[PDB]
Amino acid sequence: GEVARLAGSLSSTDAEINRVELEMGALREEVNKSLVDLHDAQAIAEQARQDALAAKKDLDDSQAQIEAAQERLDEISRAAYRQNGQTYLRTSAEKQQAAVEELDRLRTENANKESVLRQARIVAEQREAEAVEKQVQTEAAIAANSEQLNVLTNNRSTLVAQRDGAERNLAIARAQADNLQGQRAEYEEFQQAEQARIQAEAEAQAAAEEKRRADEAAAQAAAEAQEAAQQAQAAEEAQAAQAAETAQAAETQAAQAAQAQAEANDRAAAQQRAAEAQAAAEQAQREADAQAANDAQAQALREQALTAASIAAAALIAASQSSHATTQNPYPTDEDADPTDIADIQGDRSAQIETVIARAMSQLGVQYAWGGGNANGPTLGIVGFDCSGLTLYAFAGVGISLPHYTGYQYQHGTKVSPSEMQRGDLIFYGPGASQHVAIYLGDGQMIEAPNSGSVVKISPVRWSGMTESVVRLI
């Protein structure tokens, strides 16, 4: 059975599909960026313009402000002349000087504002030009990226062509494997993979226990090494302390020297014992990580064999039932032979549910094909899956054989009230499950193959048209 060659080439052309999809993404977003840049340069330009306008507004206010004060000086002189035909003469002379010096003020303020307008106008000139440039820039960047994208999508359509053909061949392979080797053939292969699953699972369980205990051993040897090294450290202390004190002081002389010898002896003794315990901790750590490496390696083989077992379970079921896609009788016509004959399909738990669900999610994106799907995967319509076809596919992974009809799937398992549904349950719609089926995924979302034109997708649970009960198979 050369499934695995096409399965591999399929999956590698799907790897190429996603290369090109991210590449297209990079270009598409490139345009999005310089679109952002353009709209912000435009906002900069319009803001520099409203700054220039603000400048002319106060410059004109300064104009007519100065002219209002000039005309008050004017009416002051007019009053003076008419009043030329004593305390008040003094204070009105002082008022006129106040007005003249105020006008001096407003004068130099207006010159400053004239320079402010010169610069606000130049700033708007500049950043308007900046926006003209960046505008044409991104129109041209769009031209380039639209053309390059059109290239990418030509490549993408040929890749998906290849992909549809390869999937179509994989369906051929699954059929030849299970439709060909009759029941007892897949039965033997299945019993083999189920046995290898239980054994490699037990083996991995043993490598995990020993890795845990070797890790405990690494810990004990490491701590003992550290203790012995600390006693070596205290020897260093007490030796330099003895050294300093004898440096700072006949028979008394021999007593000092003997204590120095005893100090050095204790030091090298605790030091050698520290070196020994630390090389021992190093061995214990090399063993603890050789054993952690084997625990990981054996756990990989454990779930590898667990998976190969689940698919061989799906294959037994597939070889157990007729093609639920054609009509031509796949049985003999003259009473002159004797075939295999297919089973009859018409009217812990947590780990089990997750295996089924992985199978349905693995088909996310597969196109709809009326009547498509079996225990081995998608099939040609009357390639893809239809709603009740997908559920049939998923539960065969845990050896649950379902009919390729919603109304009949509703008769299997246990009828739970819709309000207590949980992950793994079958949600049905239509009277007596005559219209549609989906798998509850938990957390108020479900996976389904819904209607013509929709790929296998995850959608929120729908309450309109729901049957009165859900069905729980595991």
Residue numbers in the entry: 41 to 125, 146 to 309, 315 to 412, 460 to 494, 509 to 600
Give me lines lifted from the publication on this model.
The full periplasmic region of Cg1735 (residues 20 to 600) was crystallized in two different crystal forms with a high (80 to 85%) solvent content. The trigonal form was solved by single-wavelength anomalous diffraction (SAD) techniques at 3.5 Å resolution and the orthorhombic form by molecular replacement at 4.5 Å resolution. Both structures reveal a tight complex between the C-terminal NlpC/P60 CD (residues 460 to 600) and an anti-parallel two-helical coiled-coil domain (CC1, residues 46 to 238) corresponding to the highly conserved N-terminal region in the RipA family. In the orthorhombic crystal form, the long interconnecting linker (residues 239 to 372) is present but disordered in the crystal. Instead, crystal contacts in the trigonal form promote a disorder-to-order transition in this region that extends the short HL helix into a full anti-parallel two-helical coiled-coil domain, CC2 (residues 243 to 386). The presence of this new structural element precludes complex formation between the CD and the CC1 domain to occur within the same monomer. Instead, the CD–CC1 complex now forms between two different monomers in the asymmetric unit. Analytical ultracentrifugation experiments at different protein concentrations showed that full-length RipA behaves as a monomer in solution, with no trace of dimer formation even at 5 mg/mL, the highest tested concentration, demonstrating that dimerization is due to crystallization-induced domain-swapping effects. The CC2 domain is deeply engaged in—and stabilized by—crystal packing contacts in the trigonal space group. The structure of trigonal Cg1735 soaked in Cl4K2Pt was determined by SAD phasing: two major and several minor Pt sites in the asymmetric unit were found with SHELXD, and the experimental phases obtained with PHASER were significantly improved by density modification with PARROT from the CCP4 suite, as the crystal has a high (85%) solvent content.
In the order Corynebacteriales, which includes the important pathogens Mycobacterium tuberculosis and Corynebacterium diphtheriae, the most important murein hydrolase for cell separation is the endopeptidase RipA. We present here the crystal structure of a full-length RipA homologue from Corynebacterium glutamicum, Cg1735, which reveals an unusual mode of autoinhibition. We describe how this autoinhibition is relieved by the conserved transmembrane protein Cg1604 and propose an FtsEX-independent model for septal control of PG hydrolysis via the Cg1604–Cg1735 complex. In this model, two septal TM proteins, Cg1603, with a cytoplasmic N-terminal globular core, and Cg1604, with a C-terminal globular core exposed to the cell envelope, form a signaling complex that couples intracellular cell division events with PG hydrolysis during the last stages of cell separation.
